Amino acid sequence: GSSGSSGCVECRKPIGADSKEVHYKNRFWHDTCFRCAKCLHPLANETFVAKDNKILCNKCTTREDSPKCKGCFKAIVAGDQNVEYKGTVWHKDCFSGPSSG
Ligand SMILES: [Zn+2]
Ligand SMILES: [Zn+2]
Ligand SMILES: [Zn+2]
């Protein structure tokens, strides 16, 4: 504690006193840094939610997060062919089952 100056964890830059920052979970984000990770929306004037060490908004928190692949990381579709194993599902192709060599 030779200086002790609240800084940002996103831009790793120092925050000013006049600059409206957001202190949460022993952290601080700039009025332009503090925002969602899915829609990238600033929760400066809107509520926010922190889950699994990740910042998100109420609009996203809801069940509006379609399934995503792990082999290609592409938006998966119900009709489309996919392979579910442990929480995550890999496209029929991405998934290499032992069904054959
Ligand atoms: Zn920042
Ligand atoms: Zn969001
Ligand atoms: Zn895939």
From Swiss-Prot:
GO terms for molecular function: channel activator activity; potassium channel activator activity; transmembrane transporter binding; zinc ion binding. Keywords: Acetylation, Cytoplasm, Developmental protein, Differentiation, Disease variant, Emery-Dreifuss muscular dystrophy, Isopeptide bond, LIM domain, Metal-binding, Nucleus, Repeat, Ubl conjugation, Zinc, Zinc-finger. Coiled coil: none annotated. GO terms for cellular component: cytoplasm; cytosol; focal adhesion; nucleus; plasma membrane. The keyword NADP does not apply. Isoform 1 is highly expressed in skeletal muscle and to a lesser extent in heart, placenta, ovary, prostate, testis, small intestine, colon and spleen. Expression is barely detectable in brain, lung, liver, kidney, pancreas, thymus and peripheral blood leukocytes. Isoform 2 is expressed in brain, skeletal muscle and to a lesser extent in heart, colon, prostate and small intestine. Isoform 3 is expressed in testis, heart and skeletal muscle. Residues 8-60 form the LIM zinc-binding domain. The keyword ATP-binding does not apply. GO terms for biological process: animal organ morphogenesis; cell differentiation; muscle organ development; negative regulation of cell growth; negative regulation of G1/S transition of mitotic cell cycle; negative regulation of G2/M transition of mitotic cell cycle; positive regulation of potassium ion transmembrane transport; regulation of atrial cardiac muscle cell membrane depolarization. It comes from the Eukaryota. There is a cross-link at residue 54 (Glycyl lysine isopeptide (Lys-Gly) (interchain with G-Cter in SUMO2)). It is linked to Emery-Dreifuss muscular dystrophy 6, X-linked: A form of Emery-Dreifuss muscular dystrophy, a degenerative myopathy characterized by weakness and atrophy of muscle without involvement of the nervous system, early contractures of the elbows, Achilles tendons and spine, and cardiomyopathy associated with cardiac conduction defects. May have an involvement in muscle development or hypertrophy. (Microbial infection) Interacts (via LIM domain 1) with Chikungunya virus non-structural protein 3 (via C-terminus); this interaction is required for viral RNA replication. This is Four and a half LIM domains protein 1. It comes from Homo sapiens (Human). The gene is FHL1. The chain holds residues 40 to 127 of 323 of the full protein.
